[PDB]
């Protein structure tokens, strides 16, 4: 039920040499059920999975998963941009680790540099009022605690990274929430889940993201996200 | 004082080329003292260590540590089942990473597939009342937040994984608490430590688990577990 | 703007084959701006970076970063001691992972074992009253919860590791706060940041540490440290 078995790091035979139950579960549950849940499509699941693997330092799995993402209709430029985005959100080393595995995936598919996310291009429109509010809140709270970090947050992230067009805002928020959930960073989920929902991700899609990540990032990480998600959904109803 | 020095990823000579104090501490403190603490036996320490290495993405160390576990009397089927269990609790990629290192450990010992945990076998008895209570609690709290995840929790975990006989309930709880502590997932320790104690793990054994993990998962992770453990021990006395 | 381009795991060409924007950001922002911020010098930034890479299981990057640290004036003995220190604070496996990459860095520079941190040497002076207070607090709270861990905390850490002269107290605290921030261990930052400030790290230096780590350990980790740092700074003013 899993596509492109030959592209896997470890073969079904190899997995069965240690844990045949795991191989069966991979086929019947992970690929046969989770990946088949229609509330979130294969393209979006690929973005969520790539984000999880990057955030969790499981870059070797990316050769297979990046190839699958391309097959599922994720653009090379979107994979490219996910890596750049997660340099900031997961850390530079986590992004750098992707270079070998993803370059291999691209090379096999004949994906040249001309298909990648632009170094510099026309920014998306900035909601100036919401940004003025965001900057004021952070500056008032932490401006004298870490002035450099506060300034970088504004200049590098909210006035640049988040306006880069190579991921649609919805998709950039999607990869962000996936990366956060994947490493249990529940403190930052409220802001970014609200942003994702504002950007067009549906509540059921968000529930599917959490559900998908139970498998890729472990049950406790998915479980920890639930009260945060619940609070967000309830607050939007007020 | 450390057994099977030749089976290590890095030799004592190699460790001494960077940090001779670390090599000395490994011999005198880790192997000479911690591993020798009689409150928790070598077999259980091996299970705790394997769980920690899996959860923390330190799979390369597993060739040595899985071999040691087998020497310490952990069954191949128990190692097999730990991997499958932690696919769910640590994440699929963390379990998958074990395949290469553990297959090598098994191959060297002539451990064939006939010795592994069963794909499907007769489930252990389910405490139907405690399960009805568990399902009701979760369903009431998060049923409309992530219905898919709630259903999978019931169907995949509590009505299947936890009833698989290839780990005794005590040992399955042992590996779970070890994996949780190892990545600082304190939110889920209350439930699983209670379950471990219910399943027959002693309070002193649990204290030894936390102590062992200070070395393998870092002091802060062990320290973070202490107030949770304290609260559990005190609550059971009420 | 990045020194020793040829020593990198992945070349600029390789990074550009996946994410040319990331390569540009590395040059212009990470190396061209962050590393150039004068509030924290290159030597201290190297210690912070090594600690982050060790804590986050990004040991492969260490060949380049350890070489850079040596170029920046970090002593071989200080790198040696950072590894030993983080065996305790990040975990044994995280320290062990450094052996290959750092040994390579040392070999290329002709750094022999005679330049490494001493296995045993004359301890630094212990503040006996502050230690009596620390031991009493921990013993009263957790002495009967995990007696072994409480005893090891005293004997292995505060009456040995922290008195080892191969890192100055300021630098040992620096590597500790870096390692904690890098994996989001906010629970332990209050104690260790106070200790760092007591040991001579300035508040602006601490702010630069957090800022540097936003890039190496991801924005959310740096952001999570801010309220802890704020509370510490404010408390010292009372």
């Amino acid at each position: 039920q899993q596509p492109n078995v030959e592209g896997r790091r470890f073969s079904p035979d190899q997995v069965r040499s240690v844990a045949p139950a795991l191989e069966q579960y991979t086929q019947q549950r992970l690929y046969g059920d989770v990946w088949q849940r229609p509330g979130l499509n294969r393209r979006d699941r690929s973005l969520v999975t790539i984000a999880a693997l990057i955030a969790r330092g499981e870059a070797p799995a990316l050769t297979y998963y990046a190839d699958q993402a391309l097959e599922n209709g994720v653009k090379p430029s979107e994979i490219s941009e996910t890596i750049t985005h997660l340099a900031y959100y997961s850390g530079w080393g986590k992004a750098m680790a992707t270079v070998g595995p993803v370059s291999e995936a691209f090379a096999k598919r004949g994906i040249g540099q001309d298909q990648l996310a632009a170094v510099e291009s026309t920014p998306l429109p900035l909601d100036e009022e919401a940004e003025a509010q965001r900057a004021t809140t952070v500056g008032n709270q932490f401006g004298s605690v870490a002035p450099g970090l506060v300034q970088y947050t504004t200049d590098y992230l909210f006035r640049d990274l988040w306006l880069r067009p190579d991921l649609a805002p919805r998709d950039r928020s999607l990869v962000t929430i996936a990366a956060l959930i994947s490493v249990g960073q529940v403190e930052q989920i409220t802001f970014h889940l609200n942003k994702a929902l504002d950007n067009g991700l549906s509540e059921e899609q968000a529930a599917e993201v959490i559900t998908h990540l139970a498998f890729y990032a472990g049950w406790p990480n998915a479980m920890s996200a639930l009260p945060v998600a619940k609070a967000v959904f309830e607050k939007r109803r007020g």
Side-chain angles (χ1 to χ4, degrees), chain A residues 83-216:
Chain A
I83 294 163
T84 299
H85 190 75
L86 295 184
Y88 293 92
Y89 278 90
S90 299
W92 230 257
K94 292 287 182 279
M96 280 301 307
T98 76
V99 172
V102 176
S103 71
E104 185 182 329
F106 284 173
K108 306 272 186 60
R109 308 273 290 210
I111 303 302
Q113 297 171 80
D114 64 324
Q115 298 196 52
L116 308 176
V119 171
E120 185 175 0
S121 60
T122 299
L124 301 170
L126 178 68
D127 184 345
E128 288 280 3
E129 198 181 332
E131 170 55 24
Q133 267 273 114
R134 189 213 57 82
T136 295
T137 298
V138 179
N140 285 351
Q141 200 172 10
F142 300 122
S144 60
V145 174
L149 179 55
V150 169
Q151 194 65 57
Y152 284 146
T153 304
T154 300
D155 293 341
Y156 289 179
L157 304 192
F158 291 98
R159 288 189 134 265
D160 178 25
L161 185 65
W162 280 98
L163 308 177
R164 286 172 57 85
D166 317 79
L167 284 167
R170 178 218 183 247
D171 296 320
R172 195 177 295 276
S173 287
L174 178 60
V175 294
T176 307
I177 64 168
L180 294 173
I181 293 164
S182 292
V183 298
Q185 280 163 2
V186 291
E187 194 171 320
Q188 281 82 24
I189 295 175
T190 296
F191 181 87
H192 288 286
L193 178 59
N194 277 124
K195 197 171 176 62
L197 296 167
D198 291 349
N199 288 345
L201 189 75
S202 70
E203 293 190 356
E204 72 85 15
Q205 280 165 354
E208 293 292 333
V209 170
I210 297 170
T211 304
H212 192 85
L213 290 174
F215 298 81
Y216 285 95

